Amino acid sequence: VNSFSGYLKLTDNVYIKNADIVEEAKKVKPTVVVNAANVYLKHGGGVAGALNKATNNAMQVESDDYIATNGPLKVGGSCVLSGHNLAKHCLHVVGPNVNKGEDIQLLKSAYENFNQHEVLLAPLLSAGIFGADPIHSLRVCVDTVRTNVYLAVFDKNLYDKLVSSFL
Ligand SMILES: OC[C@H]1CC2(CN1c1ncnc3[nH]ccc13)OCCO2
Ligand SMILES: [Cl-]
């Protein structure tokens, strides 16, 4: 039993809700919140910009030190950093950006990072300003993640369509 509330159950392990991931994280304080990161951990917009803003830019400061030490992530890769005031940890995961020409096949690799954590709060990878079809992102999530994932989705219109079309 966990403290997540109001989610629709899609499969044995995948749940979904129309919600702002920032407000969800502040309420639940999950062990792991997933960020929709880029390889440079430059948290300017989308989910990343919103999460970073909620940390008063502490996420960006920590991220800049991470990159200075380790260099950029890989598309499809991830790193674990602090969750600051939002969660214990933040798993920064880089889905392929279709608007950068990046290979959508890498979306499965991106979701595989979730399997290293027993429970996560997460957005649909490569969705939103990353330019991929969110219905496709959901399908890859369900077919790749085996651990317990709670998908937020703040956009109301995006959610009803994802539910109604889910197979
Ligand atoms: O999960 C979906 C991703 C992708 C997105 C934004 N997303 C968010 N998900 C959850 N909480 C959020 N807070 C702020 C943004 C956001 O949806 C439509 C446009 O891009
Ligand atoms: Cl995003």
Q: Which residue among 47, 59, 126 is best mutated to probe the pocket of ligand 1, counting the most ligand atoms within 8 A of its Cβ? A: 47
Q: Which residue among 154, 156, 158, 160 is best mutated to probe the pocket of ligand 1, counting the most ligand atoms within 8 A of its Cβ? A: 154
Find the 123 Cα to ligand 2 centroid distance in Å: 8
Find the 124 Cα to ligand 1 centroid distance in Å: 7
Residue from 82, 93, 78 nearest 31 by CA: 82
Residue nearest to atom 9 of ligand 1 (CA): 153
- Cβ–ligand 1 distance for 33 under 6 Å, the answer no
Cβ–Cβ < 8 Å for 30, 22: no
Which domains, from first to last, does the chain contain? 8-163 (3.40.220.10)
**Whole-number CA gyration radius for the chain:** 15
Atom of ligand 1 lying closest to residue 124 CA: 1
